[PDB]
């Protein structure tokens, strides 16, 4: 029932279009049940990984300015404290 044998069988077909109907008919249950429910597997299922697996710098999100080639409103102790279009500034918490 190998695919190569089936393809070799196809090669025996020799010469208006017709929509023909196939003649194919569309133990086994025991094998399916054993595979689904009672077969220990080499690879651990997600249920056991759910039990044995444990999950493990702001300067990295910024952009450093590029090099430059030139050849070919309020205040406080001298420091700005409020940005433009804003009303508070910064307050650590």
């Amino acid at each position: 029932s190998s695919i190569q044998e089936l393809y070799q069988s196809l090669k025996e077909i020799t010469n208006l279009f017709e929509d023909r109907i196939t003649k194919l008919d569309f133990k086994h249950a025991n094998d399916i049940i054993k595979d689904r429910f009672l077969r220990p597997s080499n690879a651990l299922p997600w249920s056991l990984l759910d039990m044995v697996q444990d999950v493990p710098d702001y300067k990295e999100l910024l952009k450093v300015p590029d090099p430059i080639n030139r050849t070919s409103h309020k205040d406080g102790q001298g420091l700005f404290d409020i940005p433009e279009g804003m009303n508070r500034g910064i307050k650590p918490m």
Partner: protein
């Protein structure tokens, strides 16, 4: 932002699904599952029915799923035109296309180019390679169901065509897989795609492997299958259309160093909601068109990896007597899927670029770029 507008349609062109389309300067050809090769004239006047300038030929009962055309000026005056198709039974067939001066009708003349031994293989894909100063002769490549690739050299000569087998390339894995795709580059490279998500690059001159890409992270055995491989006409880029389970993805690779550049996605990284069926580059190679099972044509900018525009297919876009809104079982064809798509050069469909696609409603549609 490019704009594409419909120019000609033809509904119910074939009696079954149209799986592939190919075009040349003189005409466009399509193949379908009903076993017919249909020729559509490119030199069609405005406001003329494409079906009037049509010619048909019966090839095989099992049906056809691939087609390609090779047209060239071989001698100073000789005209060459060949069509190669693979059937559902696994046969590779060749035909010659000629015309009369009396009535300009197309003549189909069968060619026997394969030897006895080569006829026992089941072929799936095919592709033509024209001579454009890379080598003196034309070439034909094809893949079989056992994972092997075949390379031929075609000699037109007195009319005596011969196919000389240059060699074969076997699959890089054991057990062998299914070779679903193949392509040829101008620089002389061969790309073959497999059903497990593996694509292999080999040299045309020496027939030796160079790269072996894997794009799959699979728990299901064949949930990552490669559907289309396309080489960029100008650069060293390769486009891979593969399957993510329930999705369609396009990945870009560079063939000079063998690196994964990135993926195409619209706002995971997925290009189409359903599986991507076909890919096509334009003449410049700066635009890529993808056909999807979701019934859309999407155009991408290759340089910026960004989508440019989208075309939606409707069954009502067709002559009202050639509209197929329901198939033989009763399913709705309101937004039919697209099987194949192809770019046409300027001056072929009479300037600017043109485009053709075949959809799930047994319709063939032509579009042209505005501007």
């Amino acid at each position: 932002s490019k704009v594409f507008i419909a120019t000609a349609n033809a509904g119910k062109a074939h009696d079954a699904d149209i799986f592939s389309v190919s075009a040349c300067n003189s005409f466009t050809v399509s193949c379908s599952g009903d076993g017919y090769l249909k020729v559509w004239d490119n030199k069609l006047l405005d406001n003329e029915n494409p079906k009037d300038k049509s010619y048909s030929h019966f090839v095989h009962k099992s049906g056809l799923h691939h087609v390609d055309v090779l047209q060239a000026i071989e001698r100073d005056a000789f005209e060459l035109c060949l069509v190669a198709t693979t059937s559902f039974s696994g046969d590779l067939l060749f035909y010659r296309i000629t015309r009369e001066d009396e009535t300009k009708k197309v003549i189909f003349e069968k060619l026997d180019l394969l030897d006895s031994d080569m006829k026992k293989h089941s072929f799936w894909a095919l592709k033509w390679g024209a001579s454009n100063d890379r080598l003196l002769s034309h070439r034909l490549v094809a893949t079989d169901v056992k994972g092997t690739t075949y390379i031929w050299k075609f000699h037109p000569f007195n009319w005596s065509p011969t196919l000389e087998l240059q060699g074969t390339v076997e699959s890089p894995m054991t057990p062998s897989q299914f070779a679903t795709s193949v392509d040829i580059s101008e620089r002389g490279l061969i790309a073959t795609g497999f059903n497990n998500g593996t694509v292999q690059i080999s040299e045309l001159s020496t027939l030796r492997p160079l790269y072996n890409f894997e794009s799959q992270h699979s728990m299901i055995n064949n949930s990552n299958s490669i559907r289309s491989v396309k080489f960029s006409p100008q650069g060293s880029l390769l486009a891979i259309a593969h399957d993510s389970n329930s999705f369609g993805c396009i990945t870009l690779y560079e063939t000079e160093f063998g690196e994964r550049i990135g993926s195409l996605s619209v706002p995971g990284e997925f290009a189409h909601s359903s599986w991507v069926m076909s890919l096509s580059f334009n003449d410049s190679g700066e635009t890529l068109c993808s056909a999807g099972w979701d019934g859309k044509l999407r155009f991408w900018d290759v340089k910026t990896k960004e989508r440019i525009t989208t075309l939606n297919m409707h069954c009502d876009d067709i002559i009202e007597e050639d509209i197929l809104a329901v198939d033989e079982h009763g399913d709705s064809l309101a937004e039919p899927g697209v099987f194949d798509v192809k770019f046409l050069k300027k001056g072929w469909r009479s300037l600017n670029e043109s485009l053709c696609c075949v959809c799930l409603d047994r319709s063939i549609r032509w579009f042209r770029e505005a501007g």
